[PDB]
Subunit: 480 residues, 4 copies
């Protein structure tokens, strides 16, 4: 009686819906759905995943252990997991128009940050040297980072890192100083990859420095991979030895990562011997058995779906719109008196340098957040500290996914400008000059609270008009 | 164009990607019709999968609840904080003595994050030897190559079984540790059929002033249900995956002591110093944005782990494995350590005159999913002498003791077929075995008959996480 | 002003620096009047000292003979080439099978240079534990601190004595090495009274594919004379100091196999790969200009090592130590391993109720130079329980067997005084012992009488390296 | 057989080892007859050599004065304590602000001991690039190989000269240090002809919180005499050899700040933390028994460094080098940095159309001892484009300004012969140059004539450390 009652009970538990089993979690998800419906989402690393990707990520593919590689597994039962991973690899090469005799791919790395660590582990001995764009100048923690205080990224613990920096007069990477630094530092690997950079890489110049230094050229295209797949910006694959990327962000896939690497002939050396690329086995073995265990086959299957979408004409039109929206956004910001780092943009984001407006990014970000415009404060050339940012970073991928077009991003720039004006009013009313005096005014001044409520209402009414991505408005729990 | 990509983003998987949809339908049928005996596998709940497949995936939330780098994380914070508090409750932990990190992406990086938090590069780790039931994420090197990157960045040395008994040789562990001076000792295994002597590991770690890390990935659901002894009584740090016996999404958790540790010889309080180091190793040290969809599904799985029916499930996992072991022993099989006290068994096939690679090939063809596995005494990790099997996944579908007696019977029938294939093989090589297995009409018929028996038995049990009635492949 | 600084450059030490001249005269008297029993000390020849005190000191000669980075080295090349030739001849080595580096400045950096040549940073070394008779330059760390920098830059693990027998526990060494996987194993000691089983070390090194380094510093002169078995029969690399039983200047040599490997060890390379790596680690890796005054003095010492007189000397060293041990045993002293096969003994004072620190303080006051020394069983390495003594230095002055029986008698009388100071000591601590030792007039008189007995006995023997007749201090 | 080996031990070098005695006599004659221009060479005093060749060599004295690990060291303690006292006095150092270690065996291990004391393995060091005049013990690696072991165990990066001016580019050093974050910066060189901007290095070290290490090996005697500015005004740690301009024995010293460094923001004293770390790195970290004969000779040399005659000598060293540089420039040679402010010059032969290897071969044959040396602009490290020369050694023999004008003339005549050999060489490889140099009778006659000119000039000056009248080889 009790034994069978219990067995029926745990089977019911396993087959019941989330709404029935865990209403508290279901409610949180419904609140997050409403949040994604109502906001101006300008964080340039964020996007809205398709329903079909989410259905694959939420499938029974999660149940399987499949250590190894297709057709070379350690466990049985992997006939269909092998189909998915093989299909994912094939679509990954196709999405970037790569010759499979010249390029291989690993689709098992769990996210962007460990993907880079796996490349370093594959190709570098402990304490060998890496150069990458300095984090406050637009780099990423997974390329290394250390302050005067301590090593922040563990890449800087296990490997020896050194940054390269912007030309702070132009806002572009200072390639001349990168080259001169590399002569002295002797990197074994140079990363060409940025997060908060409004320009595209001079991959040809990085390639020249890497050739002279006999360094691996790693392109980390996480922020731009969807633009690359659509063919609307130049491809790092024209030059790089290894290419890493997140599968989320501009690719618009599940949370995950890919590692691409050259295969085949590198050069015939001076003795007439072929030198072959030595990346495939080293990288595949660093991922497994080196640093990961069982692949996440639900994510790999969702990635295959995302990579199919990436080849379509609709996806190319989407990425074209991302760029055109960002240019219109930049146009409108310039017309309204804002300064852009490097003077403009060539991609999906802008960096606004707020110095000429007489207020910093931390104050503006707080007002934007209260009116449901998501952006983030950003270091700009000229800041005295990497902890007091003078700028704001904003981008177009997420709202473009919901159907914002050029005229809509002109409106986004208008509402951003209205938020900046409120921030300046709060600063003017602030009894003091420190950020705590600013937030005290921002939370007690009823007149300025009312202006922010009004602007928040304007933001939400504009955003709500657009389709929701990945779920239906009609079945949302929270329709106000 | 605008309407064009909106439609693409909101279309079903069936509409957008029929090839992937069909692969998932084939995998559903595989999970329905087979004996899934890999002891690290389970069938997770529909509710977990609905959370993992939700829009929680869209948000970037680097940092920790209430201490994020980006805004817009109010509801992500609700989920992660709920997950953390449910994690401590699932193991009946006092939150003033234990903290938890729920962001680690899987079991292997979770262990690497602990080492990065607490050890400098090239500091010393001891753990169970991989061929004796350990795990790659604790270190492993051969005579010629460092296989796990743990053994590249840290200095590793194994401890071993008593090959006479199949239990860990704690006496030799203690003696080795005196000479090797580990800074951290791992108590955890992938292919060990017995309970750990955590008290003995604690004694060695105290003497060596080493961190005691319990890696409970395989047994975490048994621990949560309170049906085997808990490593939290003894350990400094506990890692676990969330997808094995815990029956959650693919992910991991890191638990650590916090608060007051002891009073020194001078009357001063000494506090634990794990929490900040581990949290910072996970982020910003080694990971970026948390996978909020997985964390949300983990919260769901942790609520399930508190229920009476979940405890009944884990008690059944244990009783099923005991019955499974008893039946295998009665049929003449040798088990490493002679039996089991948990969810798995390790069959040593050497006394039957055949190896694990050959038997596993037959199992695969009759729809029994297991893994060939090294046994103590194997001279090459490429020629495994054993098969590893366990009860979590089929117990989730409702297999009870008499059903696992049947599983042992069908395993034995598969071994008998493998022995016939070996006897008929025109050579001694694995490729000769495979050629016979694929060309011999009589033995192909026997395998087809056993496959039909396995599928007919498995099909009668409920499907977990999807509806049998709507499956594409119902035949 | 220029003729005067040239006068100061050519004047004698007596005229230029009477304070230093007086210090040397006091040290000459100390060497004349004492029982010098530290087994690593000797009295080198006048001819060695005249070469070390020559204008060979003025030359920079980085590189190797005939391959220098500076001009002017025609005669420095003759000296280094002659030194190398005599080094190989001193140990009866085939120059087609053995090479030598004579530039290493002393024993400790010589070993570090071998590790740097053959091991990557953090690779693994095994050697005899320091408290069991090993040496710091083979690695050493305590529970809390890495003491030798060898243990900072490389990963070290000790092997130990069998505490019951006092001999190296080779069985435990072999079992430990299986788990630890050393890349290099050191066979050599500072306070081991028995002969090494070099054949057994070779067997373990072969199984582990580890370099066998013999550090023969203490026994090199015995080896050169052929009176004990040679480590060159087995080792890959042999290091030594030149100032202990070899009786040369302060310095070191590194010997290494070269040429074709044994038939069963030839592979991708058929030749040994030690010579270039070791020579390059010495220079340009870790040293600069060779000390050609020392190298020239070493050439002199190596020629002396070939003579029948030198062989007779080393024979007497062994017979003196055997007699010394027998006399100590008959006077009730416990010896580690119960005796000796070489030039030293290690007295364990446990059966006497007093430690090495107390006894050595009395020895020093009665002009007997020895060292307190850890013994097996000591609970702490700061409180050594033994005294180490040996025969090389006094044998050089002509002490024979009956003279070392007298040395043992006077050692015994010193221990008895130490026991009286302990018995009269109020407190239990070493400060109270020293307080008694410096304030008790009766025991101060007994130490004075014993000091006179030691000095009267030692003064009868020839001085080595200088003449009694020109000593400043003749009383 | 006692009487036989005791006579062996007390006989003179002439009696025991005529071959070695002969080599030393040949080297004496070479030091009499040649132009010794290697700027790291000197001629030390007889009194130093008598101390280095004394019975102080016989003592083991591990530890520090008054803190030895065993007995017999009463007089060795006097010598080391006296040497420390004189070391601080020679550089006018306040003993409450500076300490010193006098046990480091030579300059290269002294620097390695400082790194081991103050830096963990793989921490970062900046120093002057070897091809720009730096030293191997500050680090050196090529694209293919780590040459100095400093670059194996630590992470090194060079700073460079302004190749237009030949002075250190301090602006680039500072900018490089921002990016590289060195933990230690070396201010010292082997072939830099200008004075260091120690104040600028101090400012960079302060901004980077890096240790400022001055390696003053080449200039130490100039510093002691007060004829150039002192690195002790700025540096945290100062290393030096003792055998170059200091004019002492072959050895080294490590100086370090001690005592109060600063008061922190809470009013608490902050002490320097160099002394214990450095002393413990020397022993027990990296060395064993001190070389007390060298330490005793060093004490002698340090007393000699205090005299007015010594100051007059170091002033003459500078004036001689200035005139030497002026004469080389007048004869058409290019100097790196266009001149000198210290004891050496570096000739860049590019404008003469010949490399340093060819020129040094002729110098050697005409008894001018110098070294081929890399210069800025050299494409290959193995094809040095320069010749390094300096004045300490011949100034010690009484050369004055007009004499170094003649040295420059004879160097010029040797270069002219080298150019003739090159012109007569049919091939362009160095072996063809050597073949021409050894077979051309006319050019051999010219080298023989120039050799006779060099010897006739050099022989007129006093010999340092020995008397001409007792030279075995006067012809
Ligand atoms: N118990 C157990 N756990 C496992 O995880 C496992 C695996 C998968 C992980 C694994 C992979 C490669 C090697 C490996 O050894 N690779 C070598 C092969 C050659 C050699 O073994 O010397 C290599 O050089 O790659 C060892 C282990 C195989 N057999 C296993 N058994
Ligand atoms: N056999 C033998 N060989 C030796 O060379 C030796 C020595 C001299 C070298 C030495 C110096 C310090 C420590 C040392 O350990 N220092 C510790 C303090 C002691 C401890 O912690 O146990 C430190 O912290 O410095 C250990 C060894 C003392 N006793 C010895 N015995
Ligand atoms: C103790 C332990 N710790 C960590 C892990 C790694 O988890 P991951 O596969 O999610 O990285 C495992 C996985 N173990 C799997 C894969 O080998 C198994 O089949 O046993 C484990 O057993
Ligand atoms: C085996 C061995 N190898 C190396 C050394 C180091 O020689 P060094 O003192 O010249 O550095 C020693 C010194 N041994 C001295 C100091 O401890 C002794 O009294 O025993 C040694 O015994
Ligand atoms: C600045 C500096 N520091 C250290 C050293 C090393 O001294 P050592 O040769 O005694 O090891 C040198 C040696 N310099 C010698 C050998 O290169 C020379 O001819 O210049 C040095 O120039
Ligand atoms: C976001 C990003 C990453 C890291 O991805 P995560 O999934 O957050 O670990 C790595 N590189 C770049 C350039 C990125 O923008």
């Amino acid at each position: 009686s009790n034994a069978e009652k219990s067995r029926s009970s745990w089977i019911k538990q396993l087959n019941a819906s989330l709404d029935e089993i865990d209403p508290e979690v279901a409610d949180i998800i419904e609140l997050e759905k409403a949040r994604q419906w109502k906001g101006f989402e300008l964080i340039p690393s964020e996007n809205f995943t398709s329903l079909s990707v989410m259905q694959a990520v939420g499938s029974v593919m999660t149940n399987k252990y499949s250590e190894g590689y297709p057709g070379a597994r350690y466990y049985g039962g992997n006939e269909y997991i092998d189909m998915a991973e093989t299909l994912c690899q094939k679509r990954a090469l196709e999405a970037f128009q790569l010759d499979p005799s010249k390029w291989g791919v690993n689709v098992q790395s769990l996210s962007g940050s460990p993907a880079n660590f796996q490349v370093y582990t594959a190709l570098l001995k402990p304490h060998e040297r890496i150069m990458a764009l300095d984090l406050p100048h637009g780099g990423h923690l997974s390329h290394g980072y250390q302050t005067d205080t301590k090593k922040i990224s563990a890449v800087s613990i296990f490997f020896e890192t050194m940054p390269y920096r912007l030309d702070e007069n132009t806002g572009y990477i200072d390639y001349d100083q990168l080259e001169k630094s590399a002569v002295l530092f002797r990197p074994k690997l140079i990363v060409a990859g940025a997060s908060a950079y409004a320009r595209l890489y001079d991959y040809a110049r990085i390639r020249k420095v890497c050739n002279k230094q006999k360094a691996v050229m790693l392109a980390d295209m996480a922020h731009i991979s969807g633009l690359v797949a659509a063919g609307v910006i130049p491809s790092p694959f024209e030059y790089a030895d290894v290419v890493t990327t997140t599968t989320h962000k501009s690719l618009r896939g599940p949370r995950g990562a890919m590692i691409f690497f050259r295969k085949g002939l590198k050069e015939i050396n001076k003795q007439g011997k072929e030198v072959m690329y030595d990346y495939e086995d080293r990288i595949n073995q660093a991922v497994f058995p080196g640093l990961q265990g069982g692949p996440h086959n639900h994510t790999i299957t969702g990635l295959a779906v995302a990579l199919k979408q990436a080849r379509t004409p609709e996806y190319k039109a989407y990425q074209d719109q991302v760029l055109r929206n960002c240019s219109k956004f930049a146009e409108t910001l310039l017309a309204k008196g804002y300064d852009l780092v490097s003077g403009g943009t060539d991609n999906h984001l802008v960096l606004v340098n707020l110095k000429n407006k007489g207020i910093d990014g931390s104050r503006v970000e707080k007002v934007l957040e209260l009116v449901h415009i998501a952006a983030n404060k950003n270091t700009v050339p000229g800041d005295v500290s990497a902890m007091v940012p003078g700028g704001i970073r904003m981008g177009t991928p997420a709202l473009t996914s919901r159907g914002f077009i050029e005229e809509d991003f002109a409106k986004v720039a208008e509402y951003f400008d209205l938020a900046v004006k409120i921030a300046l009013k709060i600063k003017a009313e602030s009894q003091g000059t420190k950020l705590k005096d600013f937030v005290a005014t921002m939370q007690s001044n009823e007149k300025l609270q009312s202006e922010m409520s009004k602007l928040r209402e304007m933001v939400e009414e504009y955003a709500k008009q657009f389709p929701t991505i990945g779920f239906e408005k009609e079945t949302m729990r929270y329709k106000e």
